[PDB]
Amino acid sequence: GDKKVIQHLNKILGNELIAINQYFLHSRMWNDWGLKRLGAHEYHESIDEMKHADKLIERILFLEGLPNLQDLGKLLIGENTQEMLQCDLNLELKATKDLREAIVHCEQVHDYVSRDLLKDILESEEEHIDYLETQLGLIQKVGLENYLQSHMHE
Amino acid sequence: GDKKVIQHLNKILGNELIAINQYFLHSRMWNDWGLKRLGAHEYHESIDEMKHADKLIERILFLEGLPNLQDLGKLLIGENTQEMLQCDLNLELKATKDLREAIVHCEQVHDYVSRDLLKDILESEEEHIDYLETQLGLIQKVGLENYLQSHMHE
Amino acid sequence: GDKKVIQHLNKILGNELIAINQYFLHSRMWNDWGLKRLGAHEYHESIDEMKHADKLIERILFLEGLPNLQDLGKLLIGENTQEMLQCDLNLELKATKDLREAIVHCEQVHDYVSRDLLKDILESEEEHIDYLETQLGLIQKVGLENYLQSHMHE
Amino acid sequence: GDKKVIQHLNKILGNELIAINQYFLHSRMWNDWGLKRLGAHEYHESIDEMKHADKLIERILFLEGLPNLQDLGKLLIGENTQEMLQCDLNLELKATKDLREAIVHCEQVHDYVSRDLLKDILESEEEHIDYLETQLGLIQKVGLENYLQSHMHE
Amino acid sequence: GDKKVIQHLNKILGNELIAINQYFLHSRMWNDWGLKRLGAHEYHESIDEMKHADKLIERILFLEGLPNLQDLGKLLIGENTQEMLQCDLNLELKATKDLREAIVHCEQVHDYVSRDLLKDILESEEEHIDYLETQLGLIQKVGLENYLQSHMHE
Amino acid sequence: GDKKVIQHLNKILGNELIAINQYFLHSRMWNDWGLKRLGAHEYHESIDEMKHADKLIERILFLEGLPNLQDLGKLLIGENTQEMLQCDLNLELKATKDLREAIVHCEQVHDYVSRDLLKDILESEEEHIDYLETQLGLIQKVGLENYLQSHMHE
Amino acid sequence: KGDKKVIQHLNKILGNELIAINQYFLHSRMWNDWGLKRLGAHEYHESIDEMKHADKLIERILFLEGLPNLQDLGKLLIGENTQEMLQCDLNLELKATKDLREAIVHCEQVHDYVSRDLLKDILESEEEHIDYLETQLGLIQKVGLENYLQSHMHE
Numbered sequence A, B, C, D, E, F: 001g002d003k004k005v006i007q008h009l010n011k012i013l014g015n016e017l018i019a020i021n022q023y024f025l026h027s028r029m030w031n032d033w034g035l036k037r038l039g040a041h042e043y044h045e046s047i048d049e050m051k052h053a054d055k056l057i058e059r060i061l062f063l064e065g066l067p068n069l070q071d072l073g074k075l076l077i078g079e080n081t082q083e084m085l086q087c088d089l090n091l092e093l094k095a096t097k098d099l100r101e102a103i104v105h106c107e108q109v110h111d112y113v114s115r116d117l118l119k120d121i122l123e124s125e126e127e128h129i130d131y132l133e134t135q136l137g138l139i140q141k142v143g144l145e146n147y148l149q150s151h152m153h154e
Numbered sequence G: 001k002g003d004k005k006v007i008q009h010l011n012k013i014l015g016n017e018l019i020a021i022n023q024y025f026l027h028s029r030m031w032n033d034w035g036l037k038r039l040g041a042h043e044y045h046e047s048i049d050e051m052k053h054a055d056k057l058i059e060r061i062l063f064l065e066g067l068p069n070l071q072d073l074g075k076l077l078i079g080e081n082t083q084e085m086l087q088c089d090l091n092l093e094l095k096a097t098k099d100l101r102e103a104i105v106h107c108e109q110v111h112d113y114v115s116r117d118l119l120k121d122i123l124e125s126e127e128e129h130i131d132y133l134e135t136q137l138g139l140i141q142k143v144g145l146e147n148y149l150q151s152h153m154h155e
C-alpha cells in the first residue's frame, strides 16, 4: 500500500471522527431542547460518519497501514440551531476538500479501489451539504420560529 | 417497620396526591381549550402519579403503618398554559426535595427496599422535570402561539 | 352555566373524590390482608368513581365554572371487613341523596343534559348499594369466616 | 298524539333543516378555500343534523302529525372563518332554547319518549356548542393565521 | 475481591441453602397431606431460593473467592401448617437481617454491584415475608380448618 | 413401611444431596473458567440429582418416614478439570454401591416399588459413570488442552 | 441545575467511554483483518456497549445543564497481538471501574441518586466485561494460545 494513500486515508478518518462527535453532540442538544426532528436527523448523520470511519479503517488495515483513532481534531459546537447547522456545514466543506485531494492521489498511483471508496463517501458528504443548505435556506424562507416549530415532533 | 420512614412515605404519598388532582385538572383544562396534545400528556402524568400513590400505599401497609389519603395539600392551579406548566414544575421541585430527604433516612435505618421504591419514583419525577423545562424552553424558542398551535391535535 | 347547578356538580364531584380514596385504601387493605377478591372488586369501584369525577369535571368546565378538586371531606375508613362495607354503604347512601337533590335542581332550570349525566351516575351508585347490601346479607347467611374464605382468591 | 308536541317537533325540525343547509354550504366554502379540515368537520356537523331531521320526521309520522319540510328559515352565512363559526354558534344557541321548551312541554303532557328523543338531540347540539366555543377561543390563543393553517390539511 | 464481602456472600449463600431444603421439605409435606396449593406455592419459594444461591455463587467465583456449599445450617422443620409457616417466617426474618449487614459492608468498601445483587435478593425475601405474615393473618380471620380447606385444590 | 428401608432411602437421599451441591459447584466453576460446555453439562447433572431427591422425599414421606435434608456429607471438589471429573466419578462409584445394598434390602422385605425407584435411579447413575469414564478416556486420546478447547463453547 | 462536581465526574466517565469506544473498535477491526472473526465480533459488541453508555452520560449531563466534553481523547492502549489486546482492554476497565466508584460516592454525598443509579448500571456492565477478559486470558493458559485463537477464527 502506497504510503501517502494511507496518510490521506488517515486524514479522512480524522475528519470522520470529528463529525461523529460533533454530530452526535449536536443531536443530543437538539433533543434536550425538544427539537426531536433535528435530533433524529442529526443522529442519523452521525451514524453515517461512523460507517465511513469503519470502512476507512478496514481499508487501511488491508493496505497494511496503522489506523489512527488517537488524534481528535477540533469540534465545531454551535450554541443555537442556526450556528449548529453552519458549523456542520463548515466541517463538511472541509472534508469535501480533503476527499478531493485524496481521490487525486489515489488516481495518480493507480489505487482505484481506495478511489472508489472515497468517491462513495464524497457522494454522501455532498448529500449532507445539500440537506444543510436546504435547512439554512428554509429558515430564511419560513423564518426561524416556524422552522423550529416544524422540528419539534417526528 | 420503622416509624419515621413511614412518616416519610406518608409525606411522599401526600405529594403524589396533590400532583394527581393538579395534573388531572390541568389536563381537563387543556382539553376544554382545544389543546388536546397537552391535555393528553398531562393526563398521562396524572396517571403515572396515581401509580406511585398505589405503590406508596402498598409499601406503607406492608410496613404495618396507616396510609393517609385524608390530608390533601395545596393545588397550584395555573390559569394559562405558561402558569400551569410553571406550577407543575414548582410542585415537582418540592416533591423531588422530600424524595431525597426520605431516601437519606431509609439508607440511615437500612430500609433498602423503600429506598429503591423512592428512587424509582424519583427518576420518574426527574423525567417529568425534563419534560416541563423543555416545554418552557420551546415556548421561548418558537413563541407562545406556535407552541400552542403545535398542541391543538394529538 | 346556572350558578347553582355548578354548585350541585362541584358538590357531587366532592363526594366522588371522597369515594375514590376511601375505596382505594379499602382495596389495598383487603389486598394486604390476603382477601384479594374483595380488594379487586373494591379497586374497580374506586375506578368507577374516578370516571365519574372526570365526567363531572368536564361538564363543569364546559359550563364555564371552576371544578373544585381542592376540598376533601371525611373518609370513612373501617377496621374490619364488615365495617369497611358498612362505611362504603353510608357514603353511597349519602351520595345518592345529593344526587337526587341535584337532579331536582337541573330539572327546574332546564339543564336536561346535566340531569342526564347525574341520572347515569345515580344508577351506577344504586348498583354499588345493591352489591354492598348483598354482601352484608351474605355474611349473615354463610357466616363471617365462610364469607371471607370465599374472598381470598380471584 | 298531542297537537302541541307535534308543533314543537315541527319547530325543532325547522331548526335542523336550516342547520343542514347552513353547515353544508360552510363546509363547501371552507373546502373551496383549501381549509379542508374545517370543511370535513363541518360536513359531519351537517350530516348529524340530517340524522336528527330523520329521527324527528319518523316521530311526527308515528304520532300522526304532518312533517313540515317546506318552511326553511334564515341561513346564517358567514364570509370568513370567524363569521362562519359565530353564525353556527348563534344558530345553535337559538336551537338549544327551542329544544328546552319542547322538552318542558313533552314532560307536561307525559310524552316521555319524545322528551327522550329531544334530550339526545339536545346533548348533541351542546357538543356542537363546545366545539364552536373552543375554536373561537383557539383563534384568540394561537392567532387567526396559525389557526387557519392548522386547518388546511386533514 | 474484598475479603469481608465474600464472607458476607458466603453467609447469605448459607441462608439460601437452609431455605432451599426447608422450603422444599415443607412443600412435599404439604403435598403428602393433600394441601396441594400450599405444596405448589412452597415449591416455587424453594425454587426462588435456588436462583438466589446460583447468583451468589456466580458472584463469589467472579470475585475469586471460594463458594461454601459444604456447611449446611440448621433447618426449621415444622410439624403442622401453622408451625411450618412460622418457621419459614423466622428463617426469613433472620436472613433479612444478614442481608442488611452485607449491604452496609458492600456500600462501605464501594462494592456497589454486590450491593445491588443483595438489594434484589432482599426485596424478594421481603415479598416472601408478606406472603407469610398474610397467611398467618388469614388463619385468624377464616379459621384454621377453612384455611387448609382453601388450599387443597390448585 | 419397613424401618430399615427408610434408612436406606435417607442414605441414598444423603448421597443425592451431596452430588447436587458438588455438581452445582463444579458447574459454576467451569462457567467461571469459560468452559461452558462442561459447565452446562455439569449443571444438567445437578438437576438430575435434584429430581432423584425429590422422588426419594416423596416416597419416604408416603412410607411415613422422616426425610433427612439436614446432614450434608463430604463434598469432593476438584481444583482442575481432571480432578473434578475424577471426584464426580468417585462419588458416583460410592452411590452405585449404596443403591445396590438398598435394592437387596427392598427385595428381601418385599418393598418392590421402592426397589423399582432405586433401580431407575441406578440406571441413571450408571449413565453418568459412562459419561465420566468416557470424558477421562477422551483426555488421554486427544490431550487435555484439546479436550478443554472442545468444551469452551456451547 | 445539577451539582458541578457530579458533572465533572460525569464528563470524566464519559471521557473513559470515548477511549474504550475507539480502543475496542480498532481491536475489533484488527482481529478481523487477522481472520480472528469471533474475537472481532465480540469486541465490536463491546465497542457498541460503550457508545451506549456514552449516550446516556451525554443525556444526563445536558439534563443537569452541564457541557458534555467529547473533545479530549485520553490515551488508547493498542496491543499488537491478541494477548496484549485483551490485557490492554483489561487495564482500561480497571481504570474505568475505579473512576466510576469515586463518582458514585460523590453522588451519594450530594444526594443525586438518579445519577448514582445510572453509574451503577454502567459499572455493572464494565464488571461483566472484566469477567470476560479475565476468562479469555485464563483460557489462553488452559488450552494454549494457538488452540485459543483457533477457536476464534469462525463465528
Ligand code: HEM
Pocket: B020, B021, B024, B047, B050, B051, B053, B054, B069, C017, C020, C021, C024, C047, C050, C051, C053, C054
Ligand atoms: C387516591 C387517589 C387516586 C388513586 C390512588 C388512583 C389510582 C388509579 C390507578 C392505580 C389507576 C390505573 C392506571 C392504569 O390504567 O394502569 C387509575 C386510573 C384512572 N384514574 Fe385514578 N387514582 C386516584 C385519583 C383519581 C382522581 C382524582 C381522578 C380524577 C378524575 C382519577 C381518574 C382516573 C381515570 C379516568 C383512570 C382511567 C381508568 C380507566 O379508564 O380504565 N383518579 N387511577
Ligand code: HEM
Pocket: D017, D020, D021, D024, D047, D050, D051, D053, D054
Ligand atoms: C342541502 C341539502 C342536503 C345536502 C346537500 C345533503 C348532502 C348529503 C350527502 C353528500 C350525503 C352522503 C351520502 C353518501 O354519499 O352516501 C348525505 C346523507 C344523508 N342525508 Fe343529506 N343532504 C341534504 C339534505 C338532507 C335532508 C333534508 C335530509 C332529511 C333527513 C337528509 C338526510 C340524510 C341522511 C339520513 C343521510 C345518511 C346519513 C347516514 O350516513 O346515516 N339530507 N346528505
Ligand code: HEM
Pocket: E020, E021, E024, E047, E050, E051, E053, E054, F017, F020, F021, F024, F047, F050, F051, F053, F054, F069
Ligand atoms: C434439597 C435439595 C434440592 C432439591 C430437592 C432440588 C430440586 C429441584 C427440582 C425438582 C427442580 C425442577 C427441575 C425441573 O423440573 O426441570 C429444581 C430446579 C433448579 N435448582 Fe434445585 N434442588 C435442590 C438443591 C439445589 C441447589 C443447592 C441449587 C444451587 C445450589 C439448586 C439450583 C437449581 C436451579 C438453578 C434450578 C432451575 C430453576 C429454574 O427452572 O429456573 N437446587 N430443583
Ligand code: HEM
Pocket: A020, A021, A024, A047, A050, A051, A053, A054, G018, G021, G022, G025, G048, G051, G052, G054, G055, G070
Ligand atoms: C461519539 C462517540 C460515539 C457515540 C456516542 C456513538 C454512539 C452510537 C450509538 C448510540 C449507536 C447505536 C447503537 C445501537 O443501538 O445499535 C452507534 C452505532 C454504531 N457506531 Fe457509534 N458512537 C460513537 C463513536 C463511534 C466510532 C468511533 C465508531 C467507529 C470507529 C462507531 C461505529 C459505529 C457503528 C459501525 C455502529 C452500527 C451502525 C449501524 O449498523 O446502524 N461509533 N453508535
Ligand SMILES: [Fe+3]
Pocket: A150, A151
Ligand atoms: Fe424538516
Ligand SMILES: [Fe+3]
Pocket: A152, B150, B151
Ligand atoms: Fe410537544
Ligand SMILES: [Fe+3]
Pocket: B152, B153
Ligand atoms: Fe382542529
Ligand SMILES: [Fe+3]
Pocket: C151
Ligand atoms: Fe363474592
Ligand SMILES: [Fe+3]
Pocket: C152, E150
Ligand atoms: Fe390462599
Ligand SMILES: [Fe+3]
Pocket: D152, D153
Ligand atoms: Fe396543501
Ligand SMILES: [Fe+3]
Pocket: E152
Ligand atoms: Fe380432592
Ligand SMILES: [Fe+3]
Pocket: F152, F153
Ligand atoms: Fe469464545
Ligand SMILES: [K+]
Pocket: A146, A149, B146, B149, D146, D149
Ligand atoms: K406556525
Ligand SMILES: [K+]
Pocket: C146, C149, E146, E149
Ligand atoms: K367453608
